Write a protein that binds this ligand. Structure first.
Ligand SMILES: OC[C@H]1O[C@@H](O)[C@H](O)[C@@H](O)[C@H]1O
Ligand SMILES: OC[C@H]1O[C@@H](O)[C@H](O)[C@@H](O)[C@H]1O
Ligand SMILES: OC[C@H]1O[C@H](O)[C@H](O)[C@@H](O)[C@H]1O
Ligand SMILES: OC[C@H]1O[C@H](O)[C@H](O)[C@@H](O)[C@H]1O
Ligand SMILES: [Cl-]
Ligand SMILES: [Cl-]
Ligand code: NI
Ligand code: NI
Lengths: 591, 591
């Protein structure tokens, strides 16, 4: 039809293991040429390789920039639905499955994304001693130990060809693939619960560990290795070069019933885009794996309109389930009374262009995150993937210094996050850096880090946060924040120096009602600073014994430098040995 | 003036160490806007950094592709001379100094190029034992040994700031710079002669060596380490990301009195360009260094017109002094009787586009390098940075198989290489893969590898060679080919399988006259196969004792599968103990 295009008409045949990339490409161009509104896959398994994938330079915020090979290069597509009919997609090597670029009204529906060799690696811990672990790898994680004695994971094990010359080039190719499987650090996971081991920490290794094949078993050596035998050691991928679904300068995108088993980086990363829905989808590992995506499950940078995460499962990724936030760029040079040069600060922010004439920017004091003023841009001149020269309509506030920051005033995204399951990932649940109206309703949280974190800073990540209207209602937080890294189940960790906490009110107007908190010890349920107007009422708090109690904590409510904080008497806490009046009484310390 | 632009008028001030990149940029744009023909630097030292350099995707043949930061982004410039007045240019970090792209009539004159921290590293060998070397590094080569026990070179040593937060970002930045200084292998250099140690070999390490700080001295561990104490160990840079001068799709470019002290990769790399002169220039290390560029000094891919290398010094680079050659692309898929898909084979060839309609291509048998036919292109469709679909005007020769190759029929460059000094580099002198008229006159060669190599192959490098008109006259070859890797002083090593050597005549019409060969043993002066019509006459051959004699060789002239080879009786050989009649008598073996 000129309305519905079947990829098989273009040569893509399921269930054979052959490369479907070019057939898919021609089907895409025909859909655009005639204006078809849907591309369908006959249900089956489709494999995509590097050799015939479109190449484009990409800057992708909070991931690694470079030349990308892209299986679905959805540049300037409009009103196009891709229905996989529950096909499974397998990506071989360094591929970005989807990049939506200047596209509009795109629907992705009914398929799964996976890579044939994960970018992270995993092993069974078979033994442990001072300065070493003994590991067992499955076939799924090929590796070599070279003559230098260094463990190096591989894209695949070299199978000889017959033709001697095809072998020399294939070895060189496998050898250059090593970069993609570089590791950075290791983390112990509980075998039975399939989550980071209780009170285990990241152990920084670098990308080279000393190793020996005992002579089936691999011993790795590092002074700081420690782990329980029988658990699973995860090698964290060093790079974020292959995110799953990139949504960039696009609008009205919907993901329905998408399963992202794996990504080199984040599963879904959206930048400078408007209206995004992710519904009935899954971030969850494929067979034999305890880890899903090697970074965040979802992530939104300078997005507008409505961001909806509805009835999804987000489990087992190496970072947060979501983060919705803006970009700060530091004021690097003051040119004249009207003109500055801003510089993107974090490496995975380089190439993020966002300042244009007529834009309004916040001018922000760095150590306090307090806004001096807003000012309109009349000139924006991109000098590099770091520096942009900005001239304002009027001279900027005379208190502004080099080292302060700007962020664009936006129609901040309205956030609706409901019905999701968030568990077994490594870090936090949700970073709520959304200044727009935010609703967190009917989610389940079981996270090692904070289930919900208000962050943002203008000194390292350079991420704009600061909420103005948040409702967290009818959620279950079950034994969340069980790790050693974090400040509470629901916490503020904005980059506000101690000396400015008393005057900065970065997060405002938060309602926390009707939730159930199942907690195993007395770590903070709320750990707040620089908040104005928060009401915590009609919650149920219920003591458990899921994990050993951490003696470091003896306060459910840590409040500093805030105003209008109501920890209502109408909350219910049962199963604690202390009195209700003590348990609801805020402290300034963990105590 | 509107004719001559002084960079200092645009804010570039010598001898201060500040970044001159943006001032230079505005001077470049003004020169293009008004049509000025020259930009001058007041003599001094100018430093260029990453932060404000223009970023562009680049595919650069025989080097590494990616996003490049470019100090002199000479895109679409015409009739422009850059005169440095013997200024010195210092490049900090990952910068490509010059990229000439679609430019015309460009003159670069009177300056030097260097990087503040070399991409390779060097050390004094202070001790040696089984499976280890003991090294001493100077300040110029900063490094860390991390807790894993791995030696990792650094862009710089971290100097604390005062402000604690500027320190955290700077550490992250220094940490991400580590990739640029990765090593691959080590090679021992003779301290006194400043050249690869006699009969030393590359020792493959990989990018991670075990190491210990003895407690000023660094011990590295690897089973295959062996070296003489007092020599200098060079760590070969793993990447070729920052070549010195890129000349791409450009014409009529001249380099006069340019000193390239260092490059991350090749000093000068030219691709698909027409008429290039390099005169009175130097590739030669800066103070404290024994290595110059980390790959070839110069290199020309699919160039046309005249290539002139006149009165230059090319010393101490890690590869060849020059290589002038074409590209083969393998026939990966046969589509129909008229249509194939070609695929670039070597990773550093990806993104090399060269086939367009109306082009004539050679269709070549892979194992023999014999041309089946030429055929004209009517359709070229780039699928990726690897694959292009090519359709011919007529059905191609029915003997063609997948695995054969194509190369474009070109106005092959006329090559004039005269008055150059070639010495102390690691590999060969000149790879003469130039099918156009070639003149090698009045050069001095002192190379560890072959001084002059006819190479090319369609199985690994995929480089088109095959000479048709070569004159090698009045050169001095002094103790060249003193290493264990090579086949002779002047040798053929084309990728022609043994079974086709008898029928393939890939190199034709070579005159070798009036040269002086000073040789220390009886390795081949000529080692030829698949040559037709070569005359070796009026040469002087003179025995020396510069290096120990290699007992493996007892033949100055090894000839196989050739025709019309004249080793004239009018050559002079003095200082040998064998008879003249034996010494000029060809063999089929080293004997
Ligand atoms: O799960 C138990 C294990 O937990 C880790 O955090 C600890 O470092 C190991 O020594 C072992 O105690
Ligand atoms: O230069 C002398 C040295 O040369 C190297 O090629 C050899 O491996 C060392 O053991 C030492 O003999
Ligand atoms: O703390 C913010 C931080 O959170 C996660 O780690 C993300 O992966 C990062 O990109 C960054 O957004
Ligand atoms: O043998 C050919 C080979 O020669 C040198 O090593 C060059 O650095 C390579 O790019 C390649 O051209
Ligand atoms: Cl202030
Ligand atoms: Cl043949
Ligand atoms: Ni937002
Ligand atoms: Ni040529």
């Amino acid at each position: 039809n000129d309305k519905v295009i079947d990829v098989s008409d273009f040569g893509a045949i399921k269930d054979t293991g052959s490369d479907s990339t070019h057939s898919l490409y021609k089907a895409l161009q025909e859909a655009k040429k005639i204006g078809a509104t849907k591309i369908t896959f006959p249900k089956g398994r489709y494999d995509f390789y590097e050799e015939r994938a479109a190449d484009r330079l990409m800057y992708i915020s909070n991931n690694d920039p470079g030349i990308k090979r892209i299986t679905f290069p959805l540049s300037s597509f409009n009103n196009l639905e891709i229905d996989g009919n529950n096909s499974t997609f397998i990506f071989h090597g360094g591929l970005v499955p989807f990049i939506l670029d200047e596209s509009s009204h795109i629907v992705l529906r009914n398929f799964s994304i996976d890579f044939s060799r994960a970018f992270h690696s995993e092993a069974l811990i078979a033994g442990a001693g001072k300065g070493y672990l003994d590991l067992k790898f499955t076939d799924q994680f090929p590796y070599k130990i070279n003559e230098a004695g260094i463990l190096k994971f591989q894209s695949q094990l070299f199978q000889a060809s017959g033709i001697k010359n095809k072998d020399r080039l294939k070895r060189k190719q496998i050898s250059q693939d090593e970069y993609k499987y570089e590791y950075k650090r290791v983390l112990e996971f509980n075998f039975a619960l399939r989550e980071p081991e209780y009170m285990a920490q990241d152990i920084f290794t670098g990308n080279a560990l000393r190793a020996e094949k005992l002579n089936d078993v691999v011993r790795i050596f590092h002074p700081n290795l420690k782990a329980k035998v029988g658990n699973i050691l995860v090698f964290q991928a060093k790079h974020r070069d292959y995110p799953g679904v990139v949504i960039s300068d696009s609008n009205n995108v919907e993901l329905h019933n998408i399963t992202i088993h794996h990504a080199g980086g984040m599963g879904v990363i959206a930048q400078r885009s408007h209206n995004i829905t992710i519904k009935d989808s899954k971030v969850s590992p494929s067979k034999g794996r305890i880890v899903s995506t090697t970074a965040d499950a979802t992530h939104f940078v300078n997005c507008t309109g409505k961001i909806k995460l509805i009835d999804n499962l987000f489990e087992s990724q190496k970072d947060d389930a979501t983060n919705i936030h803006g970009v700060y760029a530091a004021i690097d040079k003051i040119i004249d009374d009207k003109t500055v040069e801003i510089k993107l600060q974090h490496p995975q922010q380089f190439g993020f262009d966002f300042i244009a004439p007529e834009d309004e920017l916040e001018l922000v004091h760095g150590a306090s995150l307090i806004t001096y003023e807003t000012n309109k841009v009349v000139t924006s001149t991109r000098v590099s993937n770091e520096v942009t020269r900005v001239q304002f309509i009027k001279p900027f506030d005379s208190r502004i210094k080099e080292g302060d920051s700007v962020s664009k005033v936006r129609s901040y995204a309205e956030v609706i996050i409901k019905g999701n399951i968030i568990r077994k990932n490594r870090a936090r649940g949700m970073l709520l850096n959304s200044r727009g109206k935010t609703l967190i309703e009917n989610n389940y949280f079981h996270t090692p880090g904070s289930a919900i974190l208000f962050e943002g800073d203008a000194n390292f990540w350079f991420e704009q946060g600061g909420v103005s209207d948040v409702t967290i209602k009818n959620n279950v937080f079950e034994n969340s924040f069980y790790s050693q890294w974090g400040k509470g189940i629901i916490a503020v960790d904005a980059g506000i120096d101690d000396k400015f906490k008393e005057t900065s009110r970065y997060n405002k107007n938060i309602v926390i009602k009707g939730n159930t908190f199942k907690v195993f010890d007395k770590a903070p349920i709320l750990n707040l600073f620089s908040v104005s107007n928060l009401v915590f009422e009609n919650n149920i708090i219920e003591k458990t014994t899921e994990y050993p109690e951490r003696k470091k904590y003896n306060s459910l409510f840590v409040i500093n430098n805030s105003d209008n904080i109501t920890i209502s008497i109408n909350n219910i806490l049962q199963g604690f040995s202390e009195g209700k009046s003590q348990l609801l009484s805020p402290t300034t310390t963990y105590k």
